[PDB]
């Protein structure tokens, strides 16, 4: 409305936006799992020993 979009155009844009954001977040989660398997990043009580 204010931006100048119909509710149907907004729905399609949200569909593609949600798909893209879900793919991005899935890739980020996979990358964080890979980085944890490389080197865990929460230290214990002793540190990096």
């Amino acid at each position: 409305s204010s931006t100048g979009l119909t509710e149907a155009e907004a729905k399609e844009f949200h569909a593609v936006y949600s798909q893209s954001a879900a793919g991005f977040l899935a890739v980020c989660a996979v990358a964080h799992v890979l980085a944890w398997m490389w080197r865990p990043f929460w230290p214990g009580a002793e540190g990096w020993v």
Partner: protein, 53 residues
């Protein structure tokens, strides 16, 4: 925002919102990568032993 909040794009202009989120995401990625490079254990290019102590 949620999977069902499709009307958020009736408030935010999609083109400008995507450029401000892309800019923010790139800057955040750069900051976190430099934070990893700035510490001995997570600098993958310096290649220190993982036990930096």
């Amino acid at each position: 925002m949620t999977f069902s909040t499709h009307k958020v794009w009736l408030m935010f202009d999609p083109r400008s919102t995507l450029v401000a989120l892309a800019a923010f995401l790139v800057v955040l990625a750069l900051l976190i990568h430099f934070l990893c490079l700035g510490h001995d254990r997570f600098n993958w290019l310096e290649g220190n032993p993982a036990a930096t102590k």
